[PDB]
Amino acid sequence: MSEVERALDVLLQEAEELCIGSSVVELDRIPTALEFCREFYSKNQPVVIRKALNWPAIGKWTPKYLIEALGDRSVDVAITPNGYADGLATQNGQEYFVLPLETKMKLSEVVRRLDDPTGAVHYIQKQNSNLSVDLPELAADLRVSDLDFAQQSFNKPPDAVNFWLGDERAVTSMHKDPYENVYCVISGHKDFVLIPPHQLSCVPRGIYPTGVYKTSDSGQFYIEPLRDEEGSDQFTEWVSVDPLSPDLAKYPEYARAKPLKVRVHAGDILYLPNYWFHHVSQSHKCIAVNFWYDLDYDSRYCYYRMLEQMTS
Amino acid sequence: MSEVERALDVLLQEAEELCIGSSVVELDRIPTALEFCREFYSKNQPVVIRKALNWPAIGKWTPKYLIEALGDRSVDVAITPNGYADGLATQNGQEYFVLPLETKMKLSEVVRRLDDPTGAVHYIQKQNSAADLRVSDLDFAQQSFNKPPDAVNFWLGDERAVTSMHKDPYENVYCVISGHKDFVLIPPHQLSCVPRGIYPTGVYKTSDSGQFYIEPLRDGSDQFTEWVSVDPLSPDLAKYPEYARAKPLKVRVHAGDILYLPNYWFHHVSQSHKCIAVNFWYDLDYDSRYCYYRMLEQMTS
Ligand SMILES: [Mg+2]
Ligand SMILES: [Mn+2]
Ligand SMILES: [Mn+2]
């Protein structure tokens, strides 16, 4: 055992014994601002609040209603053959991190293609504050003030408000974000697998060549590698494990992770704290809105960077 | 640089660019419980609140008044020859970590011996948990700790009494009643910059002749203690060059001020002569920072 490995062992053993990040707390009532700050924000600890929201959207947001309310405008949509936008796929003996095929099409076309269980996998996943930038009308059916219990801890308005509408086959592969995340399912349900930052040494991460999904004149999908001016591949660091069916012989370290499963239904709120690993699945035609707030830096970020150094 | 040292250098580089724990925040008024939780508790960030308390004590309490109040009672007094209780001391060519000679003498003699610079260094340290204090003024912090104080300690002592650098595993709310207290503080993540050593523990004892000496303490093979080796006021940067990378903070806390010293922060304390203070300890609520700190301790072992 190296000294670095001994230190990582100490970290994991202490966090296990102290029950750090070992569960998703489940509440039936929205907590006070002080409660949220003390018990979840300051501990970097996820919580799900059941049936917290009765926004008008939760009732009325249907694909048909959205087509009418948005005037059937053209929307940006991501397409993959496999359902893994921003995810690993193999071609000609090489594993790539692949970006989705991104295109524009009328919302009605998106919905028609969500109804074809055979064709390519579609997802309105653009994030980048796509709700407030590209679909501001939708904001009228939300009451963001209801999120105050959490916002007072972040102490700033959302840095992004995002809209998700997805196929059942669209899976978000495990990754982390540098934001505090308040996730609100409007219709259907989302299934989360979550892993806390301090378990970084149990999550295998690899450096992969990057590609993008393109389609041939025949409509056949393939991966086009991104190979830049310097000649080399364009590389991306990405989580290597599939949480739904992990290969513990290939990745012994993942045996030491304790992933947490939570399902979030229409009207539920999920607080996903900054730098938590998450893998996301969804019911068919699931609609969700999420609010991202920039993180307030402390020593835990510096420790996380140190862990990245140690596990490199 | 080795693997462990490359990791520590990454830690310190990231904390230096973000200036983590680079300043003791200064406040004019007592914050809300939410403000304190969001800004200070959750960030492990020390803060000093100026002229925050208007307790009766701050006016009344003196050696003279305390005499008449408790009535010349016998009190728990700590005594040292050098003024370094829980500090390092040399004897027989070997450096020891020495606990204080603890005794019980009546409080009128304490005051007499305080202004004799000829004698030993004395100070009173009591853990009794009154009507001259408005403890509710600290609710803002209590609500963030979500439990009453685990201890309330009274302190009265000599300017010669120096509390050497060390860390505590609890949240500290320090309230100065009379005089001022000088703190040198160091963030926990700078542990690798603070040189530590293993020392044989002892206790101070007086002779037939009243002469002080360190009695090596034992359980046989005698006990040992890990203790910080550097003196922050006159550091030896040639003997301890890693300490050049630490960035200590200095803060003076006056009568009526409140200092929040977060758990596991290194601190070296001094004070004016006959300074009086109280402080409230709260047992920490364990989080990821503590686990990282145990890891960091393993890396600097
Ligand atoms: Mg796998
Ligand atoms: Mn994400
Ligand atoms: Mn202390």
Residue numbers in the entry:
A (entry chain A): 1 to 312
B (entry chain B): 1 to 129, 139 to 228, 231 to 312
Task: Tell me what the authors wrote about this structure, in their words.
Jumonji domain-containing 7 (JMJD7) is a JmjC (3S)-lysyl-hydroxylase that catalyses the modification of Developmentally Regulated GTP Binding Proteins 1 and 2 (DRG1 and 2); JMJD7 has also been reported to have histone endopeptidase activity. Here we report biophysical and biochemical studies on JMJD7 from Drosophila melanogaster (dmJMJD7). Like hsJMJD7, dmJMJD7 forms a homodimer with each 316-amino-acid monomer possessing an N-terminal helix-loop-helix-fold domain (aa 1–42) that forms part of the dimerization interface, a core distorted double-stranded β-helix (DSBH, aa 160–294) fold comprising of eight parallel β-strands and an α-helical C-terminal domain (aa 296–310) which is also involved in dimerization. Notably, the crystallographic analyses on dmJMJD7 combined with previously reported crystal structures for hsJMJD720 reveal the unusual dimerization mode of JMJD7, which involves interactions between the N- and C-terminal regions of both dmJMJD7 monomers and is likely conserved in all animals making JMJD7.
We obtained dmJMJD7 crystals of His6-dmJMJD7.Mn complexed with its co-substrate 2OG or co-product succinate; catalytically inert Mn(II) was used instead of the cofactor Fe(II) to block catalysis under aerobic conditions, as was done for hsJMJD720. Comparison of the dmJMJD7 crystal structures reveals a flexible region (aa 123–138) located N-terminal to the DSBH β-strands, which normally forms a loop around the dmJMJD7 active site and is likely involved in induced-fit during substrate binding. Compared to that observed in the dmJMJD7.Mn. OG/succinate/N-oxalylglycine/2,4-PDCA structures, this loop adopts a different conformation and forms a non-DSBH β-strand extending the major DSBH β-sheet in the N-oxalyl-D-alanine and N-oxalyl-D-phenylalanine complexes. Notably, in the 2OG/succinate/N-oxalylglycine complexes, Trp164 is positioned to form a stacking interaction with the methylene groups of 2OG/succinate/N-oxalylglycine; the C4-methylene substitution in N-oxalyl-D-alanine or N-oxalyl-D-phenylalanine compared to N-oxalylglycine prevents this interaction.
